[PDB]
Design a protein around this ligand. Structure first.
Ligand code: HEM
Length: 452
């Protein structure tokens, strides 16, 4: 029989909005979920969504015959610069399906062999950076992880070197993209967007879009002119056919997309992993021992990364606790009932609150808050739709294998090359942008004097 949908405190015509008067809205919604349970309605002026937190409801939402990816308002604003790349396209846009079909084989686990040398290139740069630090100095963790992931995606995506490890101020592309991402997210909590006070924001937003497009269009053009074949996604996209290839502007949007979709999620994952590693020294030692036992050569080979099983488990456990893209939106394809209790109208939006999902005690046990890579010892033991840091179904993360291969490589290399110290007894503080990251996370890395 039909249930009254829980909803948190309403504030007259502001609805539930004031509850998100915070720079930590995801963490705020987690607290609401902890109070209200597996499902709640959340209203703002002109907006309604329902937050799902239980594996039970989310498995059902994960039925693609019943629910399909929705573009959240975040994605709708990101779309201004990510256009109709995969991430910000409706499933029923032909460019979604076309691009999806073309790119998927180039994002497979098999394809990761072709990117490995480039990820190694940037990973070695990270290690060398840290090798070259003076004895007193520390590492700004998410800061260097983001240098690494932006560079790695730049290099594998379109053979472009941002050379973030050569700079204080990032490449102009990266400044524009990060500033564009920031504006997209600032627009979520902007009630009066037409306030002249934002004219400069709007001018800057346009400048940043032009910077991104010009760089990527130039490089696409240079490649189409040379016909050079390389190991990058760009080569795949230029060669792909559905009969017709992606047009050059969609390819630009996919390159921009891989950067937006991948850089911070992946850098956050590395940061959260290392955080959990230093806060659990017995896990760190097990991981460090595997890295030494497995990464026997100066350069990690593709095959060796695949053998870093425990590193893989540490990464999944960090993803369980702090999925760095913590929410994704769905809509009801038809009027339906969710969970046998909650009627939904065609077009009704649902948000999957991934960190809450991942703390479903009926699935994981009472110890959900504890960092235990061992949960992942046997992945077949994890129920369907219990673990969703990479989204769902045909709209799941296309970069999942790339991200995990990257993160495993890099984590492996860090563990092989350094002993790490939580010199500040760092206190977890999760900054929310469009992704999650442990802000201010700093460590000291003491080199084991192992040559590369
Ligand atoms: C730990 C790292 C990552 C996490 C946690 C993550 C998470 C996600 C999630 C949750 C989605 C689905 C969002 C939704 O339903 O609206 C998604 C989609 C996507 N991601 Fe990832 N991502 C990661 C790394 C990457 C990387 C490295 C790339 C590119 C190389 C990438 C490219 C994409 C693309 C193109 C989509 C859209 C897929 C589609 O709808 O066809 N991601 N990601």
């Amino acid at each position: 029989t039909i249930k009254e949908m829980p909803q948190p405190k309403t504030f007259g015509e502001l609805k539930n909005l004031p509850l998100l008067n915070t720079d930590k809205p995801v963490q705020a919604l987690m607290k609401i979920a902890d109070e209200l349970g597996e499902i709640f309605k959340f209203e703002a002026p002109g907006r309604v969504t329902r937050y799902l937190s239980s594996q039970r409801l989310i498995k059902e939402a994960c039925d693609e015959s019943r629910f399909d990816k929705n573009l959240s308002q975040a994605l709708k604003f990101v779309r201004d610069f990510a256009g109709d790349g995969l991430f910000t396209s409706w499933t029923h846009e032909k460019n979604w399906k076309k691009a999806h079909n073309i790119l998927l084989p180039s994002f497979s686990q098999q394809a990761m062999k072709g990117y490995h040398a480039m990820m190694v290139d940037i990973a070695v740069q990270l290690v060398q950076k840290w090798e070259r630090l003076n004895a007193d100095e520390h590492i700004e963790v998410p800061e260097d992880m983001t240098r690494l992931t932006l560079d790695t995606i730049g290099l594998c995506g379109f053979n472009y070197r941002f050379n973030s490890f050569y700079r204080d101020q990032p490449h102009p592309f990266i400044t524009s993209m990060v500033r564009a991402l920031d504006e997209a997210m600032n627009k979520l909590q902007r009630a009066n967007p037409d306030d002249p006070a934002y004219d400069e924001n709007k001018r800057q937003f346009q400048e940043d879009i032009k910077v991104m497009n010009d760089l990527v269009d130039k490089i696409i053009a240079d490649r189409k002119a040379s016909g050079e074949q390389s190991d990058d996604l760009l080569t795949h996209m230029l060669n792909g056919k559905d009969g017709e290839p992606l047009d050059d502007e969609n390819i630009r949007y996919q390159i921009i997309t891989f950067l937006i979709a991948g850089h911070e999620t992946t850098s956050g994952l590395l940061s959260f992993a290392l955080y959990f590693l230093v806060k659990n020294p017995h896990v760190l030692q097990k991981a460090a021992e595997e890295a030494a036992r497995v990464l026997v050569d100066p350069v990690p080979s593709y095959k060796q990364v695949k053998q870093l099983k425990y590193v893989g488990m540490v990464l999944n456990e960090a993803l369980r606790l702090w999925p760095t893209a913590p929410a994704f939106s769905l809509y009801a394809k038809e009027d339906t009932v969710l969970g046998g209790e909650y009627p939904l109208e065609k077009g009704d939006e649902l948000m999957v609150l991934i960190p809450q999902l991942h703390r479903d005690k009926t699935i994981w046990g009472d110890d959900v808050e504890e960092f235990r890579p061992e949960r992942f010892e046997n992945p077949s033991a994890i129920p369907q739709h219990a673990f969703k840091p990479f989204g769902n179904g045909q709209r799941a993360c296309i970069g999942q294998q790339f991200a995990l291969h990257e993160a495993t490589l890099v984590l492996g290399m860090m563990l092989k090359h350094f002993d790490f110290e939580d010199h500040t007894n760092y206190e977890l503080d999760i900054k929310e942008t469009l992704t999650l990251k442990p802000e201010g996370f700093v460590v000291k890395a003491k080199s084991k004097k192992i040559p590369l």
